[PDB]
Design a protein around this ligand. Structure first.
Ligand code: CYC
Lengths: 158, 54
């Protein structure tokens, strides 16, 4: 995986050049926002259980048919797999928020997830709706700082 | 005016205050729970129907 600084390093290395003024400006901008991102990550970590609880509540309030018999979230096992997926999304979005780069989501989350969901019959639009509900919860909790990362997960499924 | 007429007789009730109703409140809560169960059973019957068969 990469973070923002390693991404800038790779960008300057592909061109075979030392860091210039713009590169140092970008790295400084990343360092300046680090305290805020760490605060957001700690805030998410402190309330991960409650975020997950109310995110699943929102998802299954919007689409009750998933819980009903014949729905893709009807069994103890499939409900558990669903909330485990949402917990994965929250944790890896927090990782990406700390890193400032989405490569952790590509490496650890979207490595065959869309194929898995199409194979198992998991409804992708419902999963994106749940991811969006969690994005809204986290945004109301800490602000817009993490929205993009959740959108990334959505774009990996859509 | 010399008949004995009594004006201000004391009342039956005692001077104390109202006894507390915690045990009565508990039994009322029990009745509430019993009544809630009979509606929750119907709504639960609704919850266990299949998903997309409207
Ligand atoms: C750490 C990285 C990681 C991810 C991302 C991950 C997701 C993931 N979810 C899976 C299944 C699943 N995923 C879901 C969740 C869906 N149910 C729908 O109703 C919802 C819309 C939606 C979630 C919001 C369900 C129900 C299953 C079970 C599928 C089945 O057994 O038929 C599977 C197949 C194997 C298994 O069930 O354990 C994977 C690999 N696993 C991982 O190790």
């Amino acid at each position: 995986m990469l973070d923002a600084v390693t991404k800038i390093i790779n960008r300057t290395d592909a061109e075979g050049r030392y860091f210039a003024s713009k590169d140092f400006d970008e790295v400084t901008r990343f360092f300046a926002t680090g305290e805020a991102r760490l605060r957001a990550a700690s805030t998410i970590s402190a309330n991960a259980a409650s975020i997950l609880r109310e995110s699943a509540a929102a998802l299954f309030t919007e689409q009750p048919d998933l819980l009903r018999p014949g729905g893709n979230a009807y069994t103890s096992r499939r409900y558990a797999a669903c909330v485990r997926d949402m917990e994965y999304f929250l944790r890896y979005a927090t990782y990406a928020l700390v890193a400032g780069d989405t490569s952790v989501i590509d490496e650890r989350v979207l490595n065959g997830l869309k194929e898995t969901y199409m194979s198992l019959g998991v409804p992708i639009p419902s999963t994106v709706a749940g991811v969006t509900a969690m994005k809204g919860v986290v945004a109301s909790m800490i602000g817009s700082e993490a929205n993009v990362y959740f959108d990334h997960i959505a774009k990996g499924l859509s | 005016m010399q008949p004995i007429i009594l004006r201000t007789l004391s009342a039956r009730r005692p001077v104390q205050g109202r006894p507390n109703l915690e045990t009565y409140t508990s039994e009322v809560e029990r009745w509430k729970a019993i009544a809630q169960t009979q509606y929750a059973l119907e709504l639960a019957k609704e919850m266990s129907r299949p998903a997309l068969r409207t």
